[PDB]
């Protein structure tokens, strides 16, 4: 037992390194997300910068559990990262489609880390979700669904002026 | 009687307490638009912003109202203020259509104040709406009539694309 | 349903619009309050401006609660907003005891909406009312009480020279 | 009953009370330890002024409590504050395993303090401890067991070259 | 014996000791003055600024006789800091009338200090009594005597008017 | 084909995928180690901050191999980044003696990916190797070989002393 452990349950500690995991697949999905615009055949500039951000934003999340699984005296077990579910990601509203997906799915992995803090008498933990993580991923997925409504109502992604448009104006 | 009261007639007083009521509606009708934008469904954060301001400029408008009751030795009485007749606001064009439409009402209510003012003999009141008011009402109509112009000639609302761009270039 | 909504009740959704309501209630009153004061035959500036200060804020209060609405992919409903239960509040400690009145009556609203999301497994939105809302009221209801308490020591509401000093040593 | 008082338990406010001399306590046995540390026969004097500021913070600490219980309504019942454990700390090392010790204590009495905050339906309190306490005591705990790890890594106590190399490094 | 100490007595060390223990205990006293003015139905901000000054400068008093016993090669032996003996501190008036009481009582136990000290032929000890010590005696006494009178001419403690005008034009 | 593609084997391309692979393997490793430093009970905080930057250069080597894919008109294809070969370093040395194993194997990916390059006479490749990578890989690997001999050379791993010396005046 570390010296600085106090009210950790190891259930908690496992789940902290599941969350490690999947912050670190977010960063990598729009690692591939931010390359694919980048393509000389897909060529959308401001996507490509908005994804990359959104994946050094993701190594951030990550590394702060990281921080706190040493704070409360657990121990980090890492895991292989598992590459993303598509090579190409089709079009600007597709991979803002996947990224809502995507951040939907970061946030109920946290909401249930939350659920199983309190349901663990860690105040510590559960509030540390809430103030770094909860208000976040309902910003980003807001912003997510702003930016595919715009796509849509600018008909992409069959007008690719719209992409290109949205890049400039929206994005960039 | 209060101690300042001087050639300021009942009527002008009730009449005054009733344009502070419709400044305090227009404000809350502006406010409901403005929220309208914020939608994950609407996204259109510079027609946010425009009917925002607008908000708080109507409430400008009904406190300096408020004021001149007290300036003048009338007494200021209160009335709900109706929310908006409308909760859905359909398209940018048709916002931008209903606060021409109100402010032309609140004008017509103005006029009709200064007619009142004038039928009872009293400059002060007459122009305070003339110096305060009326040209504000002026201005404010023919933006919105601009606006108006410019959304249909884009081919708004039909034209996702018209009010995205209308929103960037015009309110943006 | 929303693209953006997630783990977001229907009975939250309500709540917050009936919050919304009571934020924007509060800030009339406060409104009707400033203005009071403002009277010739009243004439306590400071008060004036305490409470016009204190209606701006309420009117914020409002519309962040609005924007989060939006963000967890509710629908906004506006109702109408009742003018207060007073034209004439009397004196400056009696306009103090209806504000600490006021905000003890929208501080249980608040902790009626915490239980409700917490019943609701919301920590988003429990958080939210945490973090932004209840350490307010909690100062708003202290500050209000120490004025309450600093009126009645100094003899008012009878002693129109303790209202006028307070006036000009606490509030100016 | 305080008219400031809402949603305020009995058992809350005497818990406040309690917490409130545990960390003027926390504060008396850190100033213990500045001062032995302050001894012509112990002569480290970054050691010592790390525990001063520890026993700054403490008094902080118990202050911003005391603004809590006025602020909620609650009546501060002081007692004494007792003399520490020791009057000798022995070395650097183990002071700072004392001082693990007590923060892990003071963490504890925190925890039960949020137990039944929460117990009550206090979200104020709850969320106060949780903002102001819960992380501070995490990271303090952290702290002081990287500071114990090290100065045995380095032969503490034994080692009076281990000692004074950690005071300039580290402390300095 | 400590390799430092010189013409220092065995009595002299055990008064340091005990003066030690009476400033920190005029800390105390002075805290909990403060937060009694900080009572929602008390309400003197600046009387409770002025004791929580007062805390803190007693504070530094202990601390530099730490100093001293630590310099002159004596041992600190800390003893319990008793609570004051009131919860309720009545009114400004009184607190004041309470300060002076502790301030006299402060500076007689000094006095016997520098008796003890010359008796023992210590005039190192005697003349840090008389610089450090003497002097801000005799000032916090008589500015605590000074506002006794100012409070009593104005009609305190009846006159809640009298300690609200001191408290902004004195203390404020 | 890519309209951009011009002398670019599919050999050379699919060993960049090889090593935006391996680059991002390698800031996986280190930011394992740099988490390892940060535990209570290893508690290096400059080595923990040395890994972690070692982490980020990593990642920057991978992004600008994708880019250059891009570049190229080659196609990124990722594939999973595997967890490192242990979860617990052991020791400053130890994770040195790694870090150096490790840069080897990153340049012996290198030249070959270099040898591959002028096989096939892509001078543009072969000059990107040579300009942005080869240097890098030995001014790396020669620090870390100067980092290693330092800590063998003052008694690490055993000396807890050494390592903690070492991250103070070399890492610090
Ligand atoms: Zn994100
Ligand atoms: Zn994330
Ligand atoms: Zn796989
Ligand atoms: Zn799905
Ligand atoms: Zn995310
Ligand atoms: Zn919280
Ligand atoms: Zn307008
Ligand atoms: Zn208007
Ligand atoms: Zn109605
Ligand atoms: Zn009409
Ligand atoms: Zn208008
Ligand atoms: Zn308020
Ligand atoms: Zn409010
Ligand atoms: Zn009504
Ligand atoms: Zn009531
Ligand atoms: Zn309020
Ligand atoms: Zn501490
Ligand atoms: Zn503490
Ligand atoms: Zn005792
Ligand atoms: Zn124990
Ligand atoms: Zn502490
Ligand atoms: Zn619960
Ligand atoms: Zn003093
Ligand atoms: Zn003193
Ligand atoms: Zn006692
Ligand atoms: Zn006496
Ligand atoms: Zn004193
Ligand atoms: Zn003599
Ligand atoms: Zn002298
Ligand atoms: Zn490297
Ligand atoms: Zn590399
Ligand atoms: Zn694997
Ligand atoms: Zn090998
Ligand atoms: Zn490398």
Redesign the interface.
């Known amino acids: 037992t570390?010296?600085?452990r106090?009210?950790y349950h190891q259930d908690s500690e496992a789940a902290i390194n599941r969350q490690i995991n999947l912050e670190?697949y977010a960063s990598?999905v729009y690692?591939?997300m931010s390359?694919?615009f980048?393509?000389?055949?897909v060529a959308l500039k401001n996507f490509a910068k908005y994804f990359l951000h959104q994946s050094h934003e993701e190594?951030e999340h990550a590394?702060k559990l990281?921080?706190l699984?040493?704070?409360?005296?657990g121990?980090?077990?890492?895991?292989?990262?598992?590459?993303?579910d598509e090579?190409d990601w089709e079009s600007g509203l597709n991979a803002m489609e996947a990224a809502?997906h995507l951040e939907?799915n970061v946030?109920?992995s946290l909401?249930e880390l939350?659920?199983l803090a309190?349901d663990k008498?860690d105040?510590?933990l559960?509030?540390?979700?809430?103030?770094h993580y909860?208000?976040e991923?309902?910003?980003a997925?807001?912003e997510?669904?702003?930016?595919?409504?715009?796509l849509?109502?600018?008909?992409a992604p069959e007008?690719g002026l719209?992409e290109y448009?949205?890049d400039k104006?929206?994005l960039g």
């Open positions: 570390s010296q600085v106090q009210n670190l990598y690692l591939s390359y694919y980048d393509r000389d055949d190594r590394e990281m921080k699984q040493n704070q409360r005296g121990r980090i077990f890492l895991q292989d990262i598992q590459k993303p090579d809502l939907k946030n109920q909401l939350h659920k309190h008498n105040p510590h559960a509030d540390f979700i809430e103030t909860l208000n991923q309902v910003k997925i807001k997510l669904g702003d930016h595919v409504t715009n849509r109502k600018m008909g007008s719209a448009l949205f104006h929206t």
